[PDB]
């Protein structure tokens, strides 16, 4: 469904990554469930909000631990909605709001 809102991120689940990859994120040792932001597409809603290596732990105050968990929530929204995101930027536990202003109509 291309009309679904798009953030413009690629992801990896923490539970799927080797120990050495997780150590490079410099997140607290008690953060074991989450989604690493692997890349951000220019001009998409995540740009200027999230950053590469952020580790998302909640969306809309609901815990997420895999790319599919985030997709389930993101796709329950419509364009024009906003989401909250809780994430670790290194040791910093942060929250941000992102307005879902794009669809995937121009992505393939």
Using CB under 5 A, list all residues that contact Cl ion.
58, 61, 84, 86
- 61 vs 106, beta carbon nearer Cl ion: 61
Residue closer to Cl ion by CB (options 58, 102) is 58
CA distance 81 to 88: 23
Q: How far is the CB of 58 from Cl ion (least distance, A)?
A: 4
* Nearer CB in complex with Cl ion: 6/57: 57
**CB atoms inside a 10 Å sphere around CB 60:** 15
Q: Are 61 and 73 in contact (CB under 8 A)?
A: no
State in angstroms the smallest separation of the CB of 23 from Cl ion.
25
In the bound complex, what is the minimum distance in angstroms from residue 89's beta carbon to Cl ion?
A: 14
Alpha-carbon dihedral angle through residues 107, 105, 54, 69, given to the nearest 10 degrees: -110
């Amino acid at each position: 469904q291309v009309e679904r809102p798009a953030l413009g991120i690629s992801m990896a689940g923490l539970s799927n990554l080797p120990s050495d990859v997780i150590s490079k994120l410099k997140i607290p040792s008690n953060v074991t469930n989450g989604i690493v932001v692997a890349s951000i597409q220019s001009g998409m809603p995540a740009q200027g909000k999230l950053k590469k290596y952020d580790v998302i732990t909640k969306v809309d105050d609901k815990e997420v631990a895999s790319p599919s968990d985030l997709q389930s929530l993101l796709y329950g929204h419509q364009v024009g909605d906003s989401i909250t995101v809780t994430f670790y930027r290194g040791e910093n536990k942060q929250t941000i709001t992102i307005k879902l202003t794009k669809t995937s109509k121009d992505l393939a």
